[PDB]
Amino acid sequence: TEFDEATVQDVVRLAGGHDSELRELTQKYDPAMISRLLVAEILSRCPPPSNDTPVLVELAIVHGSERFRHFLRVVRDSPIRPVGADEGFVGMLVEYELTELLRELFGVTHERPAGVRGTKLFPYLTDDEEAVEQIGTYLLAAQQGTEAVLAGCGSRKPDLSELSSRYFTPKFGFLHWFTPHYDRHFRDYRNQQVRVLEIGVGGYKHPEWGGGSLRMWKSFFPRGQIYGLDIMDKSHVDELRIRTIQGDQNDAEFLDRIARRYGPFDIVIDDGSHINAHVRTSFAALFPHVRPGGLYVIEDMWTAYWPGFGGQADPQECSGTSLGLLKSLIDAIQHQELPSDPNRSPGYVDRNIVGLHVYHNVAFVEKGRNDEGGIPTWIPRDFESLVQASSGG
Amino acid sequence: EFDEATVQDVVRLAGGHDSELRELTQKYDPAMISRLLVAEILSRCPPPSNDTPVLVELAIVHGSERFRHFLRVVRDSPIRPVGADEGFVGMLVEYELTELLRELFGVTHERPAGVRGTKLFPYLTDDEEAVEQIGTYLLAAQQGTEAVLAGCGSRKPDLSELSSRYFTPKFGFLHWFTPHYDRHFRDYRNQQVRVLEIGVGGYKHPEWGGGSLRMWKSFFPRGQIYGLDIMDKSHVDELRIRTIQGDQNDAEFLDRIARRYGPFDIVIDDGSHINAHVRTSFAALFPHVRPGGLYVIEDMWTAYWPGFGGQADPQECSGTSLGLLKSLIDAIQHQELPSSPGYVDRNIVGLHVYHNVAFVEKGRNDEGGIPTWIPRDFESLVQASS
Amino acid sequence: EFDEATVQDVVRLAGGHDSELRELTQKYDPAMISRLLVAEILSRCPPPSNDTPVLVELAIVHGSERFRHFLRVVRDSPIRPVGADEGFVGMLVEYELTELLRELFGVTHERPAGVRGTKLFPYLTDDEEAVEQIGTYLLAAQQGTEAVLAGCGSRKPDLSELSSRYFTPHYDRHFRDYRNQQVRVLEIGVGGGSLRMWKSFFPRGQIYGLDIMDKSHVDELRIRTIQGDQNDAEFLDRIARRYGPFDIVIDDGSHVRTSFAALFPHVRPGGLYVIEDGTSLGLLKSLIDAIQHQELPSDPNRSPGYVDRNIVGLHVYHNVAFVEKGRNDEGGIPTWIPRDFESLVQASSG
């Protein structure tokens, strides 16, 4: 909407810096625009409210003498939205300095249990005949309302399992159990300004469904930029820090173009067509654009056993399956151990895979320089010889 | 030395609450337990860096009894107990027995202070006496004390550093394993793990070997370590480390030691590297890994070498360790096969492959395959999901 | 309901290795243990967020035995055991008894898979007239199962979220490292939401709540309330001897000098005395001197008190302070160190 992608990215980049970068940021961009950007981001981070009684939390973003006042309406079963100053009972004033709020949302920072904000309970309540009866009405509501808003004003790791039920995406709960693995592999990336590409947005031909996992990744990586690729148009999903791209997963040249434009990627996820040949095309085309230390993730390898997706009944005939790829990746890892051959060159994947993690219906591939060196030729090539050479006479 | 059953029981109770610490110190003689802890501390101290030799007095206190131990600390030598007069005593360190038990073998949070008492230059009566000793001993006492105290706790060691300390080829020259081991193993450090490593080291050399067993002992403060080797390795044995003599290719014998000493949280194969041996040991010992545990295969490079029973062609993997790992991918996905699963099928939940080392996760593989009513064709799936 | 000493024995054994878990299952009846785990599971489950009511079957298996439990899971209502008839079973969840013990009360690493079995729509015959049921129960069964599964583990909860369901960021900082221990927690001053909060946060814990009023209705698994006078030093010593020693004591200001003097001695070394919300302020200041007492000039006339010898840390925040129990015996600065600045310069310059 208002917020240009390069600008959001620049803001996140500077927010991760020290004092000089924070000053630089607020000098480079209008403080009113930045405060607007933070509110939009906060509205996305807030968990569902639990309070039965509608309440207003006032979020005051302060910069020098300027106060950008946002009155957030908070109630169970309604998205948290900004309203007019008079449109409810202000249960809590929450105050942040602009640079502090930037650090909390987009910074590289340590946990801060206190000292980031100021709060005042029932800020506009005057001592009247109505006062005490109004305190009974609102005390719990103000507390719960505030909890929800405060949780949106920071970068505490969300629970992926919970986000999958919240954003309506099949990662955990019924058909799959991916999220605890995703958590283990992804959580160490959360300090970084990651670029994440997911192939397959969701909902298929439905004019409204999809983008659940995309929103999941936005919540999980507070400093990330998420991209979604789908053969269908999913522009209705675009929001702050989420970009949807329309194209074919099995078009390698096109994959190369978008990776050049938007890459390189810390993380690529394949959850698209699940057609076996597609997975192989996507991987060969997109693995070179994963950063060293990044991950390439393949979901739903179950289609490797099925003809309707270009797979095979017999698990042994894994010629062109996604499982065949995984198996071959083991040899790619071990490639420096092959008997020397003056004609053979290690392929690109050979040189660039350093780990493979395989779980039920999900596999993680580690991108890295695979150049540890094979076992020297002067270590004997049979067991009884090795014993002799290792027994120190 | 100390009976294994006793050592394991002490570790068990040290991991409990106040009632268990009482039970422990009433079941066994406090004098006996003190010598056990000191033995442990000796193997736990990092190598000292002080140039001038110093004594750290460790006094272990229980009730009215006070057990005094004098540790000689100097660089290039191992820390060892000596008599009270056999050096300058730079530091007195005092522990309650139950507190020392907690720090060495407990299930405990990190405690930055209040676990001990300390008295510097303890036997220097007069001030003028201490002043003349600052030049010679202040630094030395500080460095010596630092090393002993490191031996008196449970702080996680650096496995890559241990590789160099204990002369094991796990990191730094032929291999680069230790960062993978750290990632996979560190969350077990609380537990009274039982670890089996196949291959003690040294082969037929009469002295060498056991470096990796000493590594695991350091890394797992509450663990029992077992090493298997075809050659006698009795000289490696020490508190919390037992060597077993036998053939990793004898499936009956492996069942025997598994039943005697298991079940294992962790098994590591770093033995002959003969492809068949690797397969025999996996089939025999995998059933004896606890759910949530790990089976680790090292040095799969031999999969490509016929002198180890491997094949030069990676596609001809039917008899190799790599062929096994590939078969394990199918095991993980087994419930996705069209319409009995074997033991391994039902019990593998993760595979991690790195250069020359693979970790296998033992667990109930029973998430359920993709249900019948989900379409088995791409075109069919698209219309059903809209 | 369940015998306290038994519950503690179960939790003690659950935190061991294989021989302790088999001891557990031999020592006590597997059906009893089963009801205890379910009882515990119901206390941990988050409030469900699914609109269409669904049943989750929890099958607990020990050898030849199988204990089934059908749990009603719907929004705005607590998860409750029900009869198999009284709703639609959307998910079967299956645990080995010993594995569930490990997950709820064990000392264990995080295990992202392999702890259970799952069968989606466990009792559906064919697809000829049973797709209409698939169309409305798919999303609810996923959300309902997510809530049950969260009750079946020991994932650290959010104390902020627990405060709403039943400030806290400082409690998390100081309390979280204790979570795999079989702690004993005493809260002074108790609605018993606060005790239910610590129960949730300490999966292996025993919680005790002291109050002058009878609060026996608050009692449940791993929560006992004690009734008596918080201003009576002797009584406090007596209940500490009985139920202690405590890893953590939480003392509300709404007094303190009395309860702190009587109870600090019963805090475990490495434990915490927590003071929430004049009287309190003065005590905190003095604790600074208690920490520094080995630095006082010597006097055979003044001798260090219990607290002096036993405090190793003070953490003071807005309306809450944490006092670290431990041996305060590091040694004071030795006499041979100069006691004015100019002399310290000289003696420290080679």
Add this chain to the structure above:
Amino acid sequence: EFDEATVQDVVRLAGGHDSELRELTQKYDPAMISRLLVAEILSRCPPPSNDTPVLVELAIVHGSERFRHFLRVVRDSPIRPVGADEGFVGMLVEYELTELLRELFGVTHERPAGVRGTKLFPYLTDDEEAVEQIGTYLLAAQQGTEAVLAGCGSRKPDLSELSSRYFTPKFGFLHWFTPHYDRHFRDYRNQQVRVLEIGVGGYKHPEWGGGSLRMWKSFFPRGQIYGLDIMDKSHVDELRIRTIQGDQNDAEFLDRIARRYGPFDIVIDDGSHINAHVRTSFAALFPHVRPGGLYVIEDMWTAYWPGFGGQADPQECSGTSLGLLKSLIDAIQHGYVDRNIVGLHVYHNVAFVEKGRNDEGGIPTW
């Protein structure tokens, strides 16, 4: 040898994403960065443990260029670059420049593999000659490589161990501070911190001091360390450590340097221990501590001793460091200081003060 502004810029860009690392390598000569990283690695290497001396070749690669450094590695000697002919080359270690940047100065997750390339016994032609050298060099090579590689990353060091290594009294004889420092400082380690320690060490002695400065440099891989001392300690200055000469009891002077070098994430007072000095420094420097930062006071023991402006009576605390701490307790429950203290942590002879607005949980008193 390296410009302090340039180093801080390099650390800042290193902690960014791909486009920042590209920017880094365009902005500065890659040769120069190579020397800077090697310099950094040399101070991060633990003491080596190999008996037989060995050479570890560090090759840093950018695009086409290859910068080769040969490091001598032997017990009791510091790792230093020497010619290719001054020993046996045990190991070739190879880094892409931007990858090494990331490993040393980046904001990065832990990477157990794929950050480098390694070639053992790299200049031995045939197999028969290499077998000859197993008995002499293999173990030496492994141990040497391990020491170098330890200095090529950012693994949290052990402060207690650094205390013995760098000769500072923070742990092991007079004090037991380091486990507290570790708990309070460890979460700051991926931030480009600015650390100011009052008291460099060594006093009038012409060589001693700097121990603790080197400690912080080692502990904070992206940090800039500053040390203030009344005496001149210019011999201590190295990459990422600057020493400043001046009096801690000169409020105006402190404000002057706090504006030049601040704001600080951490300030540590281990200076004169004169009680008035401690209170002057705090009042002057606390305003320049960043929100979420720490002010640390060491050696409050002098609060009891008149020779440092203290008092034997713990109740006569009005002008002592203890008295200051006690009034910090008041501020936390309600001057600049009052509105900006959110936490106090007191341990034997060391206190940690948390900086942040004590503005939270306000209620209308009526």
